[PDB]
Amino acid sequence: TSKWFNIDNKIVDHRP
Amino acid sequence: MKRTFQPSVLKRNRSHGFRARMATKNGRQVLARRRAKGRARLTVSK
Amino acid sequence: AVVKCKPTSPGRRHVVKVVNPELHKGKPFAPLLEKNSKSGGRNNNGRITTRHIGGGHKQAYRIVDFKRNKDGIPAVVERLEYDPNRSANIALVLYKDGERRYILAPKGLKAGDQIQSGVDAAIKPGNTLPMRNIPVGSTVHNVEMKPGKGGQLARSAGTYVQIVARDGAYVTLRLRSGEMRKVEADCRATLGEVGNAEHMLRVLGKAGAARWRGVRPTVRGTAMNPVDHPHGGGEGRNFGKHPVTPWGVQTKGKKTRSNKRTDKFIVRRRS
RNA sequence: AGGACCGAACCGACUAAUGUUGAAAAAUUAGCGGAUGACUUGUGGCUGGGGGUGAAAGGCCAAUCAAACCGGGAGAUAGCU
RNA sequence: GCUCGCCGGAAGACCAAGGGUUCCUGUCCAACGUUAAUCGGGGCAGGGUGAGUCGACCCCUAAGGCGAGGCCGAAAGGCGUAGUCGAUGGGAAACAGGUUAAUAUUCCUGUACUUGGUGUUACUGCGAAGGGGGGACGGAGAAGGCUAUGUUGGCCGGGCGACGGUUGUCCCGGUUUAAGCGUGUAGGCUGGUUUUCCAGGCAAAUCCGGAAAAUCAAGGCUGAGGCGUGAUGACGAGGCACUACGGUGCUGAAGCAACAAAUGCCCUGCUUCCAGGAAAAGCCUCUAAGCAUCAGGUAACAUCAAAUCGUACCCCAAACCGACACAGGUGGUCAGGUAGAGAAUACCAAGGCGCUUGAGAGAACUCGGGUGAAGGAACUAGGCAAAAUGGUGCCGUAACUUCGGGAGAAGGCACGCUGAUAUGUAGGUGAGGUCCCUCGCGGAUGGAGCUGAAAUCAGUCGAAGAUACCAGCUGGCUGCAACUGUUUAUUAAAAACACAGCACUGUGCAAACACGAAAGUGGACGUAUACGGUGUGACGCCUGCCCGGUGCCGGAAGGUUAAU
RNA sequence: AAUUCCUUGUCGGGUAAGUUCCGACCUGCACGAAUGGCGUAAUGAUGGCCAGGCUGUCUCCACCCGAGACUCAGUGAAAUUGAACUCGCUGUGAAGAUGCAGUGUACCCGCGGCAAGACGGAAAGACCCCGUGAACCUUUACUAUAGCUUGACACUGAACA
RNA sequence: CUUUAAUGUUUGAUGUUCUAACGUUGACCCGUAAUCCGGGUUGCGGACAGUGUCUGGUGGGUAGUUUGACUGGGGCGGUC
RNA sequence: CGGCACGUAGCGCAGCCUGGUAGCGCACCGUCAUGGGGUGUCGGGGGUCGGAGGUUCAAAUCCUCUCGUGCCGACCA
Ligand SMILES: N[C@@H](Cc1c[nH]c2ccccc12)C(=O)O
Ligand SMILES: [Mg+2]
Ligand SMILES: [Mg+2]
Ligand SMILES: [Mg+2]
Ligand SMILES: [Mg+2]
Ligand SMILES: [Mg+2]
Ligand SMILES: [Mg+2]
Ligand SMILES: [Mg+2]
Ligand SMILES: [Mg+2]
Ligand SMILES: [Mg+2]
Ligand SMILES: [Mg+2]
Ligand SMILES: [Mg+2]
Ligand SMILES: [Mg+2]
Ligand SMILES: [Mg+2]
Ligand SMILES: [Mg+2]
Ligand SMILES: [Mg+2]
Ligand SMILES: [Mg+2]
Ligand SMILES: [Mg+2]
Ligand SMILES: [Mg+2]
Ligand SMILES: [Mg+2]
Ligand SMILES: [Mg+2]
Ligand SMILES: [Mg+2]
Ligand SMILES: [Mg+2]
Ligand SMILES: [Mg+2]
Ligand SMILES: [Mg+2]
Ligand SMILES: [Mg+2]
Ligand SMILES: [Mg+2]
Ligand SMILES: [Mg+2]
Ligand SMILES: [Mg+2]
Ligand SMILES: [Mg+2]
Ligand SMILES: [Mg+2]
Ligand SMILES: [Mg+2]
Ligand SMILES: [Mg+2]
Ligand SMILES: [Mg+2]
Ligand SMILES: [Mg+2]
Ligand SMILES: [Mg+2]
Ligand SMILES: [Mg+2]
Ligand SMILES: [Mg+2]
Ligand SMILES: [Mg+2]
Ligand SMILES: [Mg+2]
Ligand SMILES: [Mg+2]
Ligand SMILES: [Mg+2]
Ligand SMILES: [Mg+2]
Ligand SMILES: [Mg+2]
Ligand SMILES: [Mg+2]
Ligand SMILES: [Mg+2]
Ligand SMILES: [Mg+2]
Ligand SMILES: [Mg+2]
Ligand SMILES: [Mg+2]
Ligand SMILES: [Mg+2]
Ligand SMILES: [Mg+2]
Ligand SMILES: [Mg+2]
Ligand SMILES: [Mg+2]
Ligand SMILES: [Mg+2]
């Protein structure tokens, strides 16, 4: 499946 | 934690068993396909 | 006797019970019971088809004679009972031929009084009679609509009907709704107002009181997203729609009566 | 008497640290809420996919949900990589 | 094997669900076991599940399912009557002990019981897919009576102490016993019996129901437990043997009383309250058609039948759901001692375990804990986290308040141990002896024996007596939401949702409304004091102006206007 | 003010000092009466502010007891990876260099430590635009349509006015 | 071989009356120990109601879609 | 700042669109009442049209240069 950090929004969204 | 499969044979047979399968035009087509496929367990019963 | 409760806890603070001391404490007349079994507001398709219905206490069904055929024979009212299936109270009856039945319970009730049905029968609270034979102006409760059919008007606590006129083979009645409906005159109609009346005044007082009468919560239109219901989304309250039922027809004034088969009978609609 | 009080079982999941190739695809430890009620629980039943159910979050409908899963139309179409 | 340590409302014990040979015994160690492995829930082989009484099957039905005909639907199919299925509920009956390596309320010993068939012997109106009765039912609360169970004494057996003392007011251990049968108690419910009559109980009824009288009132159900019996039986501390050192045989004392005591039982009771608390059969009774010497019905004794299927083992887990011998999830049952209010908590018993890598080192750092000079929130987004508070009795307690609350507000004081009051008191329990008597498990009086708090006075030890474990921090101002509650299973528990209360609006019942090509079903076996929809959200004081727009309600005129 | 942009408005209070807080003013950018106004005892794992107690939260960290980290023995993973003989600096350069130029420095190889760089690993960037992309949602967008509703003809007749 | 008007008709509009299609989720009867259906009798309603075809209205309840390009990012503006 | 709308007698809008006149409300001022005022009957006056002139016979207008003022936007991250 996918690692938790990839699914998680705060770490992943990082630069909008 | 409580997971999705909570086994119970009564429910098993009532929901997926031979007779249940047999009680509906489509349930019968279920068997028909499995027979044509040459399946060794038509419906996992006693 | 209506009675406030002392605030020994919130959700008692506001309660107001109706205590009827003269109501039979103890079990009901066994052989006039059949199981009722709850509906959960659900169809024979399993589909919720009237919302907000579920749970509540168990409730055994009291039979109740609405038709009132035992003409001639008189009866005596043994006792007054509480009925879970209705607002009104019922009186266990006992006709002289040894037979017991369940009547409603007009304002007078009171154990030991004497009831009778039929074209003869005293004009007096509790006696049933074709309105053919009740004096115009009486206050007649549980009323038949088709002669011999059953009795379907004014059966709720404190309700009543007023016979105002009777030309031809017909009577015109004044329903509590304020409507003016004609009815076949040959129709039975028990005499007087129906009891409790005070029923109106209870206050329930807390959430549970509702739940355990089998009423489930009502969730507002505009508390839901667009897909669920024509109301709201909005990023903050918002409305901007003529109000409608969850299927789109307007509430707030749209009549929705369409019959014709039975318009002949309505003389004047309520307001 | 009580959707009454303090508090175990039982039901919850407010804070923190740990854990994050875990002991664990959602838990551990210390604290925390409810605890005769709109409580909680075993068994069995009914509701089906633009449909269900929803004390309403687009929540849940088998670790899947702004339209479940399986097979089919099927080599959908892809002026894009 | 001897120590040591850990759980003990479990980490002990019995199951259901689920698994499906994991059970027991031999044998093997490659693979499986997070290491080794002589060991295993692993390989191979053999063994092991014994029932009239437990359970299924079975009779009975709830939800709900299926459904001859039937109604409906382009086909497929949908709904539903008669029925017929469906337990999570009702329905006859066995207990104490022993034994297997492995099952046992199933095998064995002792002692029982249930229902039918048949026979004998008495005595008799029997008889339904039918009537009535019963089965049959909620929540909370209150004690009384009682058992499990415990403690002490007595009794029995054994002990005379590795170190000063222990022939005693000393130590250790045991002191267990069923169904069944008899008795019918504490206590619960209920007036009995006869005669006649009757529009009810679809027919019938002697039953139930109703109405009269008539006569005695004590009759009848229900009923924990105790007591007797069961039982000279069993079990039994402990003994002696032998053992292939795992065990296996044999023998066998006392086996009483007092006090305490459940959440169990009496109790499906009793009291009270509103939210008003399954069904059907088995059972009892009633008769109809029908049978009247018969058959059937009742009883005693005798006898025969009770098939079939399950029964090993795990079952808060290494055997089930979690891909794992996974810190998770999993319903029911039992529940000892010391302290304690307690199923909290700490230490123990019975019993069960030390968690399937270990051995050394005594660095940084990380995790989890303990203590800290002086300072005491200076930290920080924020006292995050830690620290502190923590029991019982008495004294005492502000604004405000819907008069309940706020409140455990706040804050004080006492607290151990010894002696006395009182060689053990207030109280609890209660045997003798005497009287009463419808003689009983009765009652009255009776006070041995047993049990035994709290107070005060006096004294006394520590730094400290609610000494461990366990066990509120408190107060002031203010926003929001009345309140208990609900929610994004897995980053949001909130001011969001709900709520009682309020209002508008629809709905006259073949209701509006919803599911549905339809039949039909829900709404409701309800009927406007009802039901749906919508908004608002306890309570208090209140809710002003605008109908031009959009919508809705009303409007028999006229203008424009569809098929035809 | 859960509404105030200007705004740390202004005045009063609390502090040695207060963009928050409590009380006011009214100049309400842009409150207001059941998409309720103003109050409110009680309740709240609710938001903001204050104080006593308390303390390793801090000044500023010390020591200690346990589990890892380290050593030996047994068993034995992982992501990543064009190929590697895989230094510093200044500069060049698809514009932020271990690898190019110039130059400085550096004997070969572990073990324990630490994370500044390998524009480290992980996921064909949500965010931004683009495609004559998708989906759900909205409405007085367009075209249709179930539903509701209107009339005509049929089922459907007789009288008398 | 008539407008100022009226007796026999074939024919619309309205209003009364009737029963006989049609409705009846009134009552009773039988199939039948049966709250289904059917048949029957009867009361009520009655050429209405309802339904079929056609038809005007309403119709985000539901569905399929459209909603331009240029652009010193895109949007807004402007432009074509 | 930029977008786009408008300042018009003392003051606020029409007229602009579709070139012209510049109106109207109340106020100002005078008469007339009344003792006087206020009010009012009643008479006259009051706008470089916000500044400006190119088009043209004719510009407040349309267009262009331009000033503050009001209103809409300085947003997605
Ligand atoms: N357990 C994860 C949280 C998590 C689980 N699944 C996720 C999926 C997406 C994001 C986070 C998670 C943690 O270490 O915090
Ligand atoms: Mg409501
Ligand atoms: Mg809301
Ligand atoms: Mg929402
Ligand atoms: Mg939002
Ligand atoms: Mg949202
Ligand atoms: Mg808004
Ligand atoms: Mg409570
Ligand atoms: Mg509590
Ligand atoms: Mg899921
Ligand atoms: Mg393709
Ligand atoms: Mg194709
Ligand atoms: Mg095996
Ligand atoms: Mg074994
Ligand atoms: Mg090995
Ligand atoms: Mg084995
Ligand atoms: Mg059955
Ligand atoms: Mg058929
Ligand atoms: Mg069916
Ligand atoms: Mg069962
Ligand atoms: Mg065993
Ligand atoms: Mg015999
Ligand atoms: Mg019966
Ligand atoms: Mg005892
Ligand atoms: Mg000695
Ligand atoms: Mg002893
Ligand atoms: Mg067993
Ligand atoms: Mg293991
Ligand atoms: Mg496990
Ligand atoms: Mg414990
Ligand atoms: Mg281990
Ligand atoms: Mg070690
Ligand atoms: Mg210190
Ligand atoms: Mg401070
Ligand atoms: Mg600082
Ligand atoms: Mg600070
Ligand atoms: Mg804290
Ligand atoms: Mg602490
Ligand atoms: Mg709340
Ligand atoms: Mg969450
Ligand atoms: Mg949360
Ligand atoms: Mg209403
Ligand atoms: Mg609200
Ligand atoms: Mg404020
Ligand atoms: Mg609104
Ligand atoms: Mg709450
Ligand atoms: Mg190693
Ligand atoms: Mg470099
Ligand atoms: Mg290194
Ligand atoms: Mg690191
Ligand atoms: Mg991409
Ligand atoms: Mg659409
Ligand atoms: Mg398309
Ligand atoms: Mg473009």
Domain residue limits, chain B: 1-46
Chains that touch C (3 or more CB pairs under 8 A): none
Pocket flag, ligand 1, residue A4 (CB < 6 Å): yes
Instruction: Give the integer Cα–Cα distance in Å for C254 and C98.
Output: 53
Instruction: Give the integer Cα–Cα distance in Å for C113 and C91.
Output: 11
Which residue lies with its CA nearest to atom 12 of ligand 1?
A4
Please name each of the domains of chain C with its CATH number.
1-113 (2.40.50.140), 117-194 (no CATH), 195-271 (4.10.950.10)
Bases of strand F lying below 7 A from some protein CB: 35-36, 41-42, 121-123, 125-127, 136-139, 148-149
DSSP letters along chain C, please? -EEE---SSTTTTT-EEE--TTS--S---GGGEE-----TTB-TTS-B-SSSB------PEE---SS---BS-EE---EEE--TT-SS-EEE--BTTS---EE--BTT--TT--EEBSSSS-SSTT-B--GGGS-TT----SB-SSTTS---BS-STT---EEEE--TT-EEEE-TTS-EEEE-SS--B--S-BS--GGGG----SHHHHHTTTBPPP--GGGS-TTT-SS--TTSS---S--B-TTS-B-SS------STTGGGEEE---
Bases of strand E lying below 7 A from some protein CB: 17-19, 62-66, 76-77, 79-80, 87, 132-134, 136-137, 198-201, 209-210, 273-279, 320-322, 328-330, 402-404, 482-485, 491, 496-501, 504-516, 520-539, 550-554
Q: Which 3 state secondary structure label does DSSP give B6?
A: coil
Say whether domain B1-46 belongs to CATH 3.30.70.20: no
Cα dihedral sign, C153-C158-C164-C166: positive
Using what technique was this structure determined?
Answer: cryo-EM
Could you give the C-alpha distances from C235 to C61, C227, C242, in angstroms and in order? 48, 15, 19
Q: In Å, what is the separation between the CA of B5 and the C1' of G43?
A: 63
